[PDB]
């Protein structure tokens, strides 16, 4: 029952700077394991018995630590580190994991490329319609969308999504999916999708059935 | 060459116990101890237990004493992981991972079991084209597969020939189904003149689907 704690919960920094993320055991162990899990694979060993580097891993990546305080540094973060990493004890059954840290990566701001999709005709013929905007290659994540429908905004009945950070280009990209009713898709006129965060936002819009 | 092979997601109602199972290759499988894995969103990773395939012996986390059985077939080199009486608590994904000879950590994992508990009824997915209306260096088609459970669907955009400027969004599941959508993006002069067609797969609805995405007209 070796509870570990680590922090910060989340973070991120740019290319290049240092990161240190620690580890406080409930009581002491005698060596800290650290794992890196990317997003969609599994955990995998980076460093054992506090400060060996498991094979293949880059110098850039040390542990250190004793008793019940322990930590991780990534010296000159690189794109591709970007993973939860979760600190382990093997010194007392059970088996524990930290919660871990999520590690992202900074870049400079950049604005969504923003792409409306009216309800397919398919759609249509079941008794539904969902409008799709996409909000592609932006950062930083926590962007802003807005609906409207006939100028009025329109919060009910929207499902979002985010992709995982790119690990290549630091990105990420979202997809906003508005669901009405066909009946009430056909009583309005226009549907805007808006994305702000700091200033001028990003609109596209269509009216319906006006080609 | 050393492996754990885990088997495909599985789908059980509520109460109805769950296997799943991990072949070993590439090494000697009784001189490993094969431990479990549970992960679920927000709550990390938890150790489960351990087997020892030389004889058997196990040890579980007492969190999972009336919970998790480990066995092993020594003879198909492969180890199981049954849980009684499901709830919806153990939907996850379950890893099974070997521990290293000499030290103290994991040193092979498998790719993972996500485990779906759920009343839900399989239902398949409606799959719609993203055109944009009436009439740039670029544009951005897209794809809608709305109203599938259980997870997963596989999607590509020409049966996989188109695989850059892609961003297949997770999926998200309201109200006991599940949608997802897809972006991608090509030169303005590409489509459509060269067919881009989203292609969808709902395994356990046996769903197979090709959605040409067509131009908006009058
Ligand atoms: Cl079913
Ligand atoms: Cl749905």
């Known amino acids: 029952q070796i509870v570990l704690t680590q922090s910060p919960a989340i973070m991120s920094a740019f290319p290049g700077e240092s990161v240190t993320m620690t580890c406080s055991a409930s009581?002491?162990?005698?060596?800290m394991y650290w794992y890196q899990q990317k997003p969609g694979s599994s955990p995998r060993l980076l460093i054992y018995?506090?400060?060996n580097l498991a094979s293949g891993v880059p110098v850039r990546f040390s542990g250190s630590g004793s008793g019940t305080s322990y930590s991780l540094t990534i010296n000159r973060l690189e794109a591709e580190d970007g993973a939860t990493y979760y600190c382990?004890?093997?010194?007392?059954?059970?088996?524990?994991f930290g919660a871990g840290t999520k590690l992202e990566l900074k870049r400079a701001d950049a604005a969504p490329t923003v792409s409306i999709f009216p309800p397919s005709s398919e759609q249509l013929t079941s008794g539904g319609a969902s409008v799709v905007c996409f909000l592609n290659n932006f950062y930083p994540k926590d962007i802003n969308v807005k609906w409207k429908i006939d100028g009025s905004e329109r919060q009910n009945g929207v499902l979002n999504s985010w992709t995982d950070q790119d690990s290549k280009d630091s990105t990420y990209s979202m997809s906003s999916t508005l669901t009405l009713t066909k009946d009430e898709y056909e009583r309005h006129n226009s549907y805007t999708c808006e994305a702000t965060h700091a200033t001028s936002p990003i609109v596209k819009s269509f009216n319906r059935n006006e080609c | 060459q050393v492996q754990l092979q885990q088997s495909g997601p599985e789908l059980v109602k509520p109460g109805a116990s769950v296997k799943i199972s991990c072949k070993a290759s590439?090494?000697?499988?009784?001189?490993?101890?094969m431990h479990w894995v549970k992960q679920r969103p927000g709550q990390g990773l938890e150790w489960i237990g351990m087997?020892?395939?030389?004889?058997?012996?196990?040890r579980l986390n007492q969190k999972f004493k009336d919970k998790a059985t480990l066995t092993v077939d020594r003879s198909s080199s492969t180890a199981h992981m049954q849980l009684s009486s499901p709830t919806s608590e153990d939907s996850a994904v379950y890893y099974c991972?070997?521990?290293?000879?000499?030290?103290?950590?994991?040193?092979?994992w498998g790719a993972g079991t996500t485990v779906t508990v759920s009343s839900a009824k399989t239902t398949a997915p409606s799959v719609y084209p993203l055109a944009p209306v009436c009439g740039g260096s670029s544009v951005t088609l897209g794809c809608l597969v709305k109203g599938y459970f259980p997870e997963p669907v596989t999607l590509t955009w020409n049966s996989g020939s188109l695989s850059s400027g892609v961003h297949t969004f997770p999926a998200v599941l309201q109200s006991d189904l599940y949608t997802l959508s897809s972006s991608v993006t090509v030169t303005s002069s590409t489509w459509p003149s060269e067919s881009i067609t989203c292609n969808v797969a709902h395994p356990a609805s046996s769903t197979k689907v090709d959605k040409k995405i067509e131009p908006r007209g009058p």
């Open positions: 087997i020892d395939p030389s004889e058997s012996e196990s």
């Open positions: 382990q004890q093997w010194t007392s059954y059970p088996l524990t």
């Open positions: 590439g090494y000697s499988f009784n001189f490993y101890w």
């Open positions: 991972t070997r521990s290293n000879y000499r030290y103290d950590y994991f040193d092979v």
């Open positions: 009581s002491s162990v005698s060596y």
């Open positions: 018995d506090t400060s």
